[PDB]
Amino acid sequence: PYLFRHYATSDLAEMLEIYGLPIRLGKYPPGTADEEKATLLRAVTGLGHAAAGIIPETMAIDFQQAAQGSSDPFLAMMRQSEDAISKAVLGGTLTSTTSQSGGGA
Amino acid sequence: SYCTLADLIEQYSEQKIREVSDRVNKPATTIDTVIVDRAIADADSEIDLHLHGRYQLPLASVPTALKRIACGLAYANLHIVLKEENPVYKTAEHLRKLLSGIANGKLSLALDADGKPAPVANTVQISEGRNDWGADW
Amino acid sequence: SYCTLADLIEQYSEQKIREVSDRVNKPATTIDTVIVDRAIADADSEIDLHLHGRYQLPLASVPTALKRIACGLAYANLHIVLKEENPVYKTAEHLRKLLSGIANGKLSLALDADGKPAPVANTVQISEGRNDWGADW
Amino acid sequence: SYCTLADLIEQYSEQKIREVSDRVNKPATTIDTVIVDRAIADADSEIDLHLHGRYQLPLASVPTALKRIACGLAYANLHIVLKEENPVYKTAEHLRKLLSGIANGKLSLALDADGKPAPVANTVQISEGRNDWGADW
Amino acid sequence: SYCTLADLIEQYSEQKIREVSDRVNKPATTIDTVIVDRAIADADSEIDLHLHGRYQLPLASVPTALKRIACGLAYANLHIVLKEENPVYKTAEHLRKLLSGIANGKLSLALDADGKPAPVANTVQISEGRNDWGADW
Amino acid sequence: SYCTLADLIEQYSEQKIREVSDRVNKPATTIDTVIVDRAIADADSEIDLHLHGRYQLPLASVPTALKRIACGLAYANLHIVLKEENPVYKTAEHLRKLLSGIANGKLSLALDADGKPAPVANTVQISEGRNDWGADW
Amino acid sequence: SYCTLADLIEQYSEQKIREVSDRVNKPATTIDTVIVDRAIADADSEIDLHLHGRYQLPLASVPTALKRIACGLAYANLHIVLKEENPVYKTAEHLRKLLSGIANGKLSLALDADGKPAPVANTVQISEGRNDWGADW
């Protein structure tokens, strides 16, 4: 369960790192020079934090929505690991987390 | 000045330039430098029209393909009357097609002698860019 | 210099080069090296125009197909007047089609002698890449 | 060297090669090995241009269809002036169509003598692949 | 060897093969086995090019339609110069169309003598297949 | 053997078969059974190529339309040189169109004498089929 | 047997059938019943090819339009050599167009003498049909 939690948390951290700016790819026509290609790379890299930009009509840039995901799987796996560890150690789970129900309390 | 009188001679022989450049003496005897200079100027002007959107117009160096294109255009311009079927007209149209290809980003401007030309800063432009909270605070 | 005078001779015989390179003596007697050199330079310039976007222009070695293309283009350029129906014009157009195919990523540049050419670093470019939390911490 | 002088002779008779290879003596008397060698080199160069994207260029063995294509291309190249309507030009265009078909993944490269050629490792490439938790832990 | 000299004779008479196979003696007197062998080899090579993607190339048996195609292609190859309008060229193009149809999965390869050919294992490939919990546990 | 020499005679007279089957004696005197047999074999091979995907190739009985097609194809094959405008070529193309229509599931194979041919089991194939809980338990 | 010799005579006169059916005697003197029988058989075979998908092939009765089509096809088949521009060829193509229209469900097969033909049970097929709880329980 420790390894399960570790993997889930690391993957969630990476996914948090990737959200926000969408991955985008720039295209150039034949006969583009190395200086112009480096310029295009710099522009594409800056477009995420740059609100505006201009390119020749012969060039194109597309946006892809890189992540388009949710954290629910990782949270569920971490909760499972937490519950397993609590049961194995203390024999119960209430002592570590607040029980959100009554009646059977 | 992407080409000179010497370039035109070395491309088209001297006798043909003597024929097409002299309008006063029949048979021609001497090359009139003014007409050749104006033809070269017009060729340079058309090339500038085709190249202003991708490079700095006052080029400090001339690519060799630019020299060939300028010489061809000047020779075509030197004709008072030119038919559609004239081979020089076909060569001029071919050179214009190359110029259009260069303009449309389909062909590149090659070396001048050893270094690259000076691409203009069109694509460089982007907003200032706001990325606070990512400066290692 | 993707081709030389020796290459042009070995491709088109010496008598034809003697005819098309001499503009002063009739019948021709000697090959004028200046005209051949300029024709080769113009052919190299056109090939550079077609190849700058995919390879380093100052090539340290010449592929053999490049030699054939340069020789054909130089021979075509050596003609003062060239018709559309002239077979040399058709060969030049064929070579231009090969050059366009190479430029458009449809044909590859072959070996020079034993090693590959030097593809430029166009496609190499990508962002720096942020992948923290995955460095075995 | 996908073909040799012996192959060209055995395909096109020796008298025709003697005619088209000798440019100095009229009537022709001897085959000039240099011209044939260069024609074969140019044919090999074009085939390499067409085949570099799917196979290793320095092939250790020559497929027989490759030999036929090389011989045809060399014979076509041996002509100083070639018309569009010349039958050898049509055969060369047919061979170029086969080469394009091979390049475009529409035709395959057959046996050399008994074993397959060496397809390049283009399609082989894939990421390293992360599949932990499935290693029988 | 999808066809032999005997097959070519039995298809096109012996006099025609004698004419088209002898290049040294006029009038022809004997059939040169080397030229016929090379023509058959080239025909087999083209058929292999067209058939490698669907069957094992080193076929242990020859379908009869394959024999007809090979004979036609060899006869077409035996001509030093062939026009577009030549009927043998039309027959060769027809056979090439059949070969393309076979390659494109539009026509099938028939019996050799009594048994089917050996289709290659292209379509056979699929993943290993994970279906635990369904093994009658 | 979808057709025989007797069928070819009964379709095209005996004099025409005598002309087109004898290549050694001028004027023709006898029908050469070997050439007719090979022509019939090639016709059967082409029909097998066109019919293998829908029926068992080693047919135990011959449909009559198959006999007509085989006779026409054999007669077409018996010609050493055949033009596009030759009427027999047009008839052969018509028969090939019928064969293609049969192959493409647009035309059916009729009776042999009284019973249907043997359609192959292509469409028959389906998975084993899991339908437990529906076996009247 | 959708048509007979009497039908062919009553359609095309007897003199024309005598001309086209006799291949041995010049001028023709007698009608050869074998050739007419085979022509009728081939016509019936083609019609069966066109009609097997919609009706039972061993028809117990012959529609009259079927008789006209069979007679036309037999007359067309009786010609050893037939051109594209021959009017009988045009009539045969017209009849083939009618046959295709009947096959494609665009035209119907009319009465034989007083009763309808026997349409095959193609469209009849449907699953067994499970509709329990609706049997008036």
DSSP, residue by residue, chain A? -HHHHHHHHHHHHHHHHH-SSPPEEEE--TT--HHHHHHHHHHHHHHTT-S-B---TT-EEEE--S----SHHHHHHHHHHHHHHHHHHHS-STTTS-----S--
Farthest CA pair distance, chain B: 84
**What is the nearest CA distance from B34 to chain C, expressed in angstroms?**
23
The span from the CA of A62 to the CA of C78, in Å, is: 47
Query: What is d(CA G42, CA F69) in angstroms, rounded to the nearest whole number?
Result: 10
G68, G80, G70, G100: which is closest to G35 by C-alpha? G80
Distance of CA E3 to the CA centre of its chain: 8
Cβ-based contacts of D99 with chain E (< 8 Å): none
Beta bridge partners of A63: A24
Indicate the SS3 state at residue D55.
strand
Q: Are C8 and C74 in contact (CB under 8 A)?
A: yes
Give the SS3 label for residue C130.
coil
B110–C38: do the CB atoms touch at under 8 Å?
A: no
| Residue F34 contacts E where some CB pair is shorter than 8 Å | yes
CA triple A88-A91-A96, angle to 5 deg: 90
- Contact between E57 and D111 under an 8 Å Cβ cutoff? The reply is yes
Measured from the Cβ of residue B38, the count of other Cβ atoms closer than 10 Å reads 14
Contact B39, B74 (CB under 8 A): yes
Contact B107, B101 (CB under 8 A): yes
- Cβ–Cβ under 8 Å, residues B41 and B73: no
* Long-range pairs of D78-86 with CB within 8 A, sequence gap ≥ 24: D78/D17, D78/D20, D78/D21, D78/D35, D78/D36, D78/D39, D79/D20, D80/C12, D80/C13, D80/C16, D80/D23, D81/C87, D81/C88, D82/C87, D82/C91, D83/C87, D84/C87, D84/C90
**E136: region left, alpha or beta (phi > 0 left; psi from -120 to 50 alpha):** left
CB-nearest partner of B123 from A34, A39, A51: A39
DSSP 8-class letter at D119? B
* Token output for D12: 């096109």
Q: How far is D48 from chain C (nearest CA, A)?
A: 6
Q: Two tokens at G130? A: 């499970």
Way the structure was solved: cryo-EM
Cβ-count burial G90-109 (b if 16+ within 10 Å, e if not): eebeebbebbeebbeeeeeb
Which residues 56-85 of B are in CB contact (within 8 Å) with A?
none
Cβ G38–F13 below 8 Å, yes or no?
no
Q: Please list the residues that pair with A53 across neighbouring strands.
A: B126
Q: Which of residues 4-23 of F touch E (CB under 8 A)?
A: 23
Angle between helices E64-77 and E5-21 (to 10 degrees): 10
8 Å CB contact of D48 and C68 = no
Q: Do C24 and C75 meet the contact criterion of CB atoms below 8 Å apart?
A: no
Interface probe for C, chosen from A12, A17, A61 (most Cβ of C below 10 Å), is: A17
Chains E and F touch (3+ CB pairs under 8 A): yes
The rounded distance, in Å, linking the Cα atoms of E96 and B30 is: 64
Q: Contact, G2 vs G67, CB < 8 A?
A: yes
Is B16–C80 a contact, with Cβ atoms under 8 angstroms apart? yes
Q: Name residue G124's beta-bridge partners.
A: none
3-state class of E57 per DSSP? coil
Q: At what angle do helices G5-21 and G33-51 cross, to 10 degrees?
A: 120
| G31 vs G14: CA distance, rounded Å | 9
Task: Report in angstroms the alpha-carbon separations of E23 from D20, E27, E41, E79.
Answer: 17, 9, 19, 11
Residue type, G37: D
In terms of phi and psi (left: phi > 0; alpha: psi -120 to 50; beta: otherwise), the region of D20 is: alpha
Both structure tokens of G46: 């083609």
Q: CA-to-CA distance for E5 and E34, rounded, in angstroms?
A: 10
Resolution (A): 3.1
Q: C116 phi and psi, to 5 degrees?
A: -70, 160
At F81, list the tokens: 């040189």
C54: DSSP letter: T
F13 φ/ψ sector (left φ>0, alpha ψ -120 to 50, else beta):
left
DSSP string, E82-119: --TT-HHHHHHHHHHHHHHHHHTTSS----SSSS---B
The pair phi, psi for residue F88, each rounded to 5°, is: -65, -35
F113 by DSSP, 3-state: which? coil
- Strand-pairing partners, residue D55, are D119
DSSP code, position F111: -
Q: Which residues contact A67 (CB under 8 A, 6 or more apart)?
A: A15, A18, A19
Instruction: Provide the β-strand partners of residue G67.
Output: none
Cβ–Cβ < 8 Å for D110, D65: yes
Does residue B133 come out as left (phi exceeding 0), alpha (psi in the -120 to 50 range) or beta? left
Q: In whole angstroms, give the CA distance from residue G58 to residue G73.
A: 19
Angle between helices D33-51 and D5-21 (to 10 degrees): 120
- F45's CB contacts (< 8 A; 6+ apart) are E63, E64, E65, E67, E68, E110
In angstroms, the separation between the Cα of residue B115 and the nearest Cα of chain C is 10
Question: What are phi and psi for residue F10, nearest 5 degrees?
Answer: -65, -20
Question: Cα-Cα-Cα-Cα dihedral of B19, B24, B29, B33, to 10°?
Answer: -80
Residue D70 has phi, psi (to 5 degrees) of -65, -40
| F64 C-beta neighbours (distance < 10 Å), count | 20
Spatial distance between the Cα atoms of A6 and C136, rounded to a whole number of angstroms: 11
Residue F11's CB is within 10 A of a number of other CB atoms, namely 22
G81 alpha-carbon distance from chain centroid: 22
Q: Is C101 near chain A, with CB under 8 Å?
A: no
Q: What is each CA distance from D1 to D37, D50, E42, in whole angstroms?
A: 9, 15, 17
C-alpha angle F39-F40-F42 in degrees, rounded to nearest 5: 65
Give the Cα separation of B70 and B2 in Å (integer): 6
- For E10, list phi and psi in degrees, rounded to 5: -65, -20
| Contact partners, residue G47, CB within 8 Å, separation at least 6 | G2, G66, G69, G70, G73, G99
Find the discontinuities in chain G where C to next N exceeds 2.5 angstroms and give the residue preceding each.
none
Contact C125, A41 (CB under 8 A): yes
Cβ of C123 under 8 Å from any chain A Cβ?
Answer: no
Cα–Cα distance for residue pair B59/B48, rounded to 1 Å: 10
Q: Which candidate from C53, C125, C132 shows the least CB-CB separation from A41?
A: C125
Asked if the Cβ–Cβ distance from B88 to C81 is below 8 Å, we say yes
Which residues have CB under 8 Å from G28's CB, separation 6+? G18, G19, G21, G22
Is there a contact between E52 and D112 (Cβ–Cβ < 8 Å)?
no
Tell me: cis bond preceding F27? Omega within 30 of 0 counts: yes
Q: What is the C-alpha separation between A35 and A41, in angstroms, rounded?
A: 10
**Residue of B129, B125, B119, B127 whose CA lies nearest to B53:** B119
Separation between Cα atoms, residue A97 and residue E100, nearest integer Å: 72
Give the three-state DSSP class for G104: coil
Give the span between the Cα atoms of D47 and C65, in whole angstroms: 9
Using a CB-CB cut-off of 8 Å, the residues of chain G touching F136 are none
Residue in chain E closest to F104 (alpha carbons) equals E106
CA atoms of G11 and G4, how far apart (whole Å): 11
Determine which of F13, F55, F64, F99 to mutate to test the interface with G (most G C-beta atoms within 10 Å): F64
The CB density around residue B105, as the number of other CB atoms within 10 Å, is 20
Cβ F97 vs Cβ F126: under 8 Å: no
Cis amide linkage into residue E87, ω under 30° from 0: no
- CA proximity to E44, closest of D62, D100, D111: D111
Instruction: Take residue F107 and report the two structure tokens written for it.
Output: 């035309």
Task: Measure the CA angle with vertex G54, ends G49 and G56; round to 5°.
Answer: 80
| DSSP code, position D4 | -
Residue A22 exposed, middle or buried by CB count within 10 Å (0-12, 13-18, 19+): middle
Furthest CA-CA distance within chain F:
84
Is the bond into G27 cis (omega within 30 degrees of 0)?
Answer: yes
Q: Tell me if the bond preceding D58 is cis, omega within 30° of 0.
A: no
Question: What is d(CA E106, CA E100) in angstroms, rounded to the nearest whole number?
Answer: 9
E21/B5 Cα distance (integer angstroms):
61
- CB burial of C5-44 (b: ≥16 within 10 Å; e: otherwise) equals bebbbbbbeeebbbebbbbeeeebeebbeebbebbbbbbb
Q: B28 φ, ψ to 5°?
A: -60, 150
Contacts (Cβ under 8 Å, ≥6 apart) of F59: F112, F117, F118
* Structure tokens that stand for E121 in this block: 């294992």
Per-residue three-class SS string for chain B: CCCCHHHHHHHHHHHHHHHHHCCCCCCCCCCCHHHHHHHHHHHHHHHHHHHCCCECCCCCCCCHHHHHHHHHHHHHHCCCCCCCCCHHHHHHHHHHHHHHHHHCCCCCCCCCCCCCCCECCCCCCECCCCCCCCCCC
Question: What separation in angstroms does the CA of E117 have from each of B42, D113, E56, F53?
Answer: 72, 21, 9, 14
Residue indicated by tokens 């048994």: E115
Query: Burial level of F16, CB count in 10 A (0-12/13-18/19+)?
Result: middle
d(CA D33, CA B93): 41
Q: Do strands A60-63 and A24-27 pair parallel, antiparallel, or not at all (unpaired)?
A: antiparallel
Name the amino acid, one letter, at F39: A
- The Cα of A99 is separated from the nearest Cα of chain B by a number of Å equal to 37
What is the longest distance spanned by two Cα atoms in chain G?
Answer: 84
Closest residue, chain A, to B119 (C-alpha): A36
State the Cα–Cα distance between residues F82 and E95, nearest whole angstrom: 14
**Structure tokens belonging to residue E78:** 């035996």
Task: Give F119's strand partners.
Answer: F55
CA distance E82 to E91: 12
CB C73 within 8 A of CB C8: no
Question: How far from each other are the two terminal CA atoms of chain B, in whole angstroms?
Answer: 55
Are the CB atoms for B71 and B3 separated by under 8 Å? yes
User: How many CB atoms are closer than 10 A to CB G25?
Assistant: 10
